[PDB]
Amino acid sequence: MELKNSISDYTEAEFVQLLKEIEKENVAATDDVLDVLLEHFVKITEHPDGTDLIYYPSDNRDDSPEGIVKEIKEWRAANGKPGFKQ
Amino acid sequence: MELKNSISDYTEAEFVQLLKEIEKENVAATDDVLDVLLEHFVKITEHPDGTDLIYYPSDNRDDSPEGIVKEIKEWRAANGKPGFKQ
Amino acid sequence: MELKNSISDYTEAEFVQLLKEIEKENVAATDDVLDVLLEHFVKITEHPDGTDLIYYPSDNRDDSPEGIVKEIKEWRAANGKPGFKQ
Amino acid sequence: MELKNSISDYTEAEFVQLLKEIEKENVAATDDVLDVLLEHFVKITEHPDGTDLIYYPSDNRDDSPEGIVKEIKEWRAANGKPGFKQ
Amino acid sequence: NKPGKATGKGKPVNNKWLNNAGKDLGSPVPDRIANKLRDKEFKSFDDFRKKFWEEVSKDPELSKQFSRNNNDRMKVGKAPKTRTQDVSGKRTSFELHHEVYDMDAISVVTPKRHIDIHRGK
Amino acid sequence: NKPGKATGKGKPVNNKWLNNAGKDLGSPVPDRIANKLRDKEFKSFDDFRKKFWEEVSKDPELSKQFSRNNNDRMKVGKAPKTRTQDVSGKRTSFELHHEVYDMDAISVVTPKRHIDIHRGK
Amino acid sequence: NKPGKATGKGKPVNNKWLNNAGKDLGSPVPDRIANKLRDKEFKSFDDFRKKFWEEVSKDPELSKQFSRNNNDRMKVGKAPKTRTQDVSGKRTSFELHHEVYDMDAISVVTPKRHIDIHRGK
Amino acid sequence: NKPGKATGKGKPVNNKWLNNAGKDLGSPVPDRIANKLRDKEFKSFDDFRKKFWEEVSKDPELSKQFSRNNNDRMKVGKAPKTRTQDVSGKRTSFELHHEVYDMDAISVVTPKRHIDIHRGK
Ligand SMILES: [Zn+2]
Ligand SMILES: [Zn+2]
Numbered sequence: 064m065e066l067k068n069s070i071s072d073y074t075e076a077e078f079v080q081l082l083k084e085i086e087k088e089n090v091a092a093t094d095d096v097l098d099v100l101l102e103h104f105v106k107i108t109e110h111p112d113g114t115d116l117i118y119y120p121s122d123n124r125d126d127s128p129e130g131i132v133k134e135i136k137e138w139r140a141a142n143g144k145p146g147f148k149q
Numbered sequence: 150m151e152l153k154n155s156i157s158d159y160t161e162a163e164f165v166q167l168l169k170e171i172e173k174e175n176v177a178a179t180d181d182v183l184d185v186l187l188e189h190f191v192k193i194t195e196h197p198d199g200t201d202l203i204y205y206p207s208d209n210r211d212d213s214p215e216g217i218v219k220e221i222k223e224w225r226a227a228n229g230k231p232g233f234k235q
Numbered sequence: 236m237e238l239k240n241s242i243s244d245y246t247e248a249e250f251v252q253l254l255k256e257i258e259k260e261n262v263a264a265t266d267d268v269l270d271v272l273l274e275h276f277v278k279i280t281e282h283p284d285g286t287d288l289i290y291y292p293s294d295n296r297d298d299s300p301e302g303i304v305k306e307i308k309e310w311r312a313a314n315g316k317p318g319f320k321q
Numbered sequence: 322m323e324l325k326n327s328i329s330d331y332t333e334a335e336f337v338q339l340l341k342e343i344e345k346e347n348v349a350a351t352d353d354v355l356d357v358l359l360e361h362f363v364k365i366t367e368h369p370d371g372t373d374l375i376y377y378p379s380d381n382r383d384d385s386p387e388g389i390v391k392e393i394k395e396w397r398a399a400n401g402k403p404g405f406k407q
Numbered sequence: 408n409k410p411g412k413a414t415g416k417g418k419p420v421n422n423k424w425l426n427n428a429g430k431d432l433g434s435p436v437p438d439r440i441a442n443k444l445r446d447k448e449f450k451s452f453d454d455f456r457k458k459f460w461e462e463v464s465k466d467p468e469l470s471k472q473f474s475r476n477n478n479d480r481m482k483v484g485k486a487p488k489t490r491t492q493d494v495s496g497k498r499t500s501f502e503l504h505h506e507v508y509d510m511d512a513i514s515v516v517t518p519k520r521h522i523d524i525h526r527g528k
Numbered sequence: 529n530k531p532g533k534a535t536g537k538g539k540p541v542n543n544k545w546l547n548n549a550g551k552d553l554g555s556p557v558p559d560r561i562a563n564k565l566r567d568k569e570f571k572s573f574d575d576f577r578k579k580f581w582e583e584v585s586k587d588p589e590l591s592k593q594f595s596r597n598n599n600d601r602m603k604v605g606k607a608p609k610t611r612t613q614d615v616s617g618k619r620t621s622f623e624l625h626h627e628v629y630d631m632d633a634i635s636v637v638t639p640k641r642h643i644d645i646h647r648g649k
Numbered sequence: 650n651k652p653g654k655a656t657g658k659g660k661p662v663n664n665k666w667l668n669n670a671g672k673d674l675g676s677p678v679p680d681r682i683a684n685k686l687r688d689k690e691f692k693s694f695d696d697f698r699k700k701f702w703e704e705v706s707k708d709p710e711l712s713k714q715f716s717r718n719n720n721d722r723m724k725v726g727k728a729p730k731t732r733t734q735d736v737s738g739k740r741t742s743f744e745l746h747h748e749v750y751d752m753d754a755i756s757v758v759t760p761k762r763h764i765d766i767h768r769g770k
Numbered sequence: 771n772k773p774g775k776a777t778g779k780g781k782p783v784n785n786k787w788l789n790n791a792g793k794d795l796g797s798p799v800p801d802r803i804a805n806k807l808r809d810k811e812f813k814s815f816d817d818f819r820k821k822f823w824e825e826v827s828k829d830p831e832l833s834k835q836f837s838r839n840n841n842d843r844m845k846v847g848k849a850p851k852t853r854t855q856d857v858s859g860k861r862t863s864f865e866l867h868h869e870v871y872d873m874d875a876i877s878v879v880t881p882k883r884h885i886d887i888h889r890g891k
């Protein structure tokens with residue numbers, strides 16, 4: 064779909080769609096497209112663990128699109144950064 | 150992607166890609182495309198429970214693409230029907 | 236992508252993306268997904284010729300996404316119907 | 322879709338699907354995905370003009386997917402390189 | 408549809424919230440969900456339905472009652488898919504029945520049961 | 529469904545090849561196309577159909593008679609979409625009528641006409 | 650970037666508008682395009698660039714100077730792709746050079762030529 | 771690139787199989803996996819690699835050691851993504867190091883460690 068410049072441009076639902084697009088490319092024959100989408104995810108979330116949120120989720124939360132969104136939301140808030148679009 | 154008319158046209162890896170396409174549409178604003186892919190899934194798998202394999206997985210298996218493929222593979226084999234492409 | 240309920244929900248650019256998605260499905264192995272997207276196109280444009288705008292463009296305009304948009308825009312205006320989003 | 326590492330892995334019909342995937346991204350908000358697909362197109366076709374075949378077609382041929390495939394097929398044959406999958 | 412404010416308190420639910428969505432008037436709006444939507448404005452009922460399902464996906468005790476694929480649907484405001492045996496034609500997901508934004512007059516029913524409710528059954 | 533080779537001569541067609549696809553027995557297999565398929569083996573008619581349309585997309589004299597979107601369809605082995613007035617329900621693309629792989633007995637017709645043909649109309 | 654109103658008259662162009670985008674200061678803003686954008690408000694230059702290319706795709710005399718794939722790009726506000734020989738690394742599409750919304754101080758250049766302009770060349 | 775059969779015994783691994791992929795020679799081929807590939811023909815190592823990872827995704831004891839997103843990758847023959855701290859440039863997934871199709875000489879290592887190994891570190 065369309066890649067927005069920041070987290071504030073994505074509603075939670077829209078961010079979930081980006082995650083599902085990443086999941087689709089994750090099972091593609093190559094990582095050509097996947098890797099670009101992962102760079103975009105790392106860039107906009109600004110979370111220090113980057114892709115780990117996806118491939119190495121914490122045991123303290125669900126290994127799911129909802130869990131990823133929740134962890135991201137909690138971290139950005141704990142660090143005074145703009146959250147998802149309302 | 151391309152929709153084959155039989156389970157025997159799909160390798161296990163290819164079927165997972167279809168499940169992932171289904172998951173992507175599952176989070177789309179409407180179910181227009183999702184519903185066509187589900188009808189296709191129901192038609193080729195031929196399992197009596199149809200979409201339940203995706204939305205209502207048994208507790209005896211993993212709620213995941215690997216689990217869905219595994220259950221289909223076993224049920225088809227148990228019923229003497231052709232399996233995934235080798 | 237996301238299928239909006241009416242023409243007024245689509246900017247011209249967004250409508251072009253829907254056309255390119257139709258073009259992609261047009262060359263897919265089957266018409267399963269294509270046909271649903273075509274029904275949506277017919278429904279929201281409300282043009283009497285429906286799919287002909289796509290598969291049988293008038294000689295008076297370009298056989299292209301831009302041409303389709305232009306013809307649609309001219310017809311909806313000539314009939315006092317809401318146009319694309321500004 | 323799946324990106325093959327050689328022209329010989331693609332049938333003419335499959336290559337057209339790739340061109341159509343390229344056209345879809347061509348109208349996406351950013352060029353993030355488009356650019357990866359173009360690099361791939363350039364790599365497998367091996368034509369010295371690379372992306373020009375898509376964005377700057379010669380007047381001696383049709384500006385279309387069928388024209389792009391035709392020019393690639395002739396150039397590869399003329400240079401003794403393997404052609405599309407039969 | 409005309410805008411309005413959601414009202415109502417709802418009812419407490421167990422770990423089988425929708426087990427009876429295919430019977431009588433279906434499942435009630437969970438109180439926890441009602442609390443999150445109470446006094447909120449919605450441009451239309453459809454806008455209410457989306458927010459409704461979204462809140463469900465956020466409620467730990469409710470989301471755990473749904474599969475991963477169904478939780479993803481609710482997260483984007485779409486009703487979860489019902490079991491195959493409860494669908495009716497192209498209607499394959501739970502529906503909201505009015506007994507417009509009064510959460511105490513709204514219940515969750517399967518499409519099959521919903522059709523019977525309106526056919527006098 | 530059963531393999532076999534394509535045989536036949538076909539007929540010369542003008543720049544409006546499918547103008548009569550919705551009348552009588554529709555349009556014939558163009559002679560130029562027949563020359564490209566003659567003596568070829570096909571595992572099934574469906575296979576012949578895909579190959580048929582791909583050949584059409586490669587013939588300059590025929591392709592120019594179709595829009596860009598219809599040429600793209602033929603390039604992948606799918607029949608072009610008919611005008612809206614010629615469809616019949618979910619059948620929205622030209623069909624091949626048998627009067628086997630004998631191109632002299634095969635014709636191109638719209639869905640609406642194809643149905644009528646088999647009904648004596 | 651700060652908002653502003655586009656200004657300027659631009660210059661008349663022939664059927665080879667960007668032929669000299671890889672030389673000197675590049676191609677000027679067409680007068681016809683300047684007329685469509687003059688006195689308009691834009692939240693940022695990027696917003697200006699998108700509208701700019703969008704207007705180009707709508708100008709018959711200019712759009713005909715671009716391929717189908719490049720016209721599609723401009724239609725969504727993206728700059729057209731340059732010829733392979735004019736790219737520079739990941740910069741593969743025409744760029745706008747300032748000599749912020751003064752269309753008479755804005756020109757279209759290839760990435761290769763643009764880099765040289767700023768490197769004092 | 772050259773065909774051949776897979777041979778070897780491998781070794782038993784715990785519930786943290788790849789904890790040492792970034793040290794020494796990394797993790798060994800699990801004995802259970804070796805049993806599934808032993809005596810099989812592979813047109814190339816890349817082919818062995820895809821098959822290897824697909825087998826991993828099918829072994830309950832190993833799969834549970836990976837997240838859902840990494841299991842999906844292995845299911846299609848692709849190596850799981852490493853933690854960010856273990857990548858090296860564009861090399862972001864576990865790699866197989868040779869000490870042929872001899873599983874007793876093959877090990878799983880992170881990109882960063884793999885580079886160091888070949889540099890004497
Ligand atoms: Zn009701
Ligand atoms: Zn017939």
Ligand SMILES: [Zn+2]
Binds near residue numbers: 746
């Ligand atoms: Zn500059």
Ligand SMILES: [Zn+2]
Binds near residue numbers: 866867868884887888
């Ligand atoms: Zn090594």
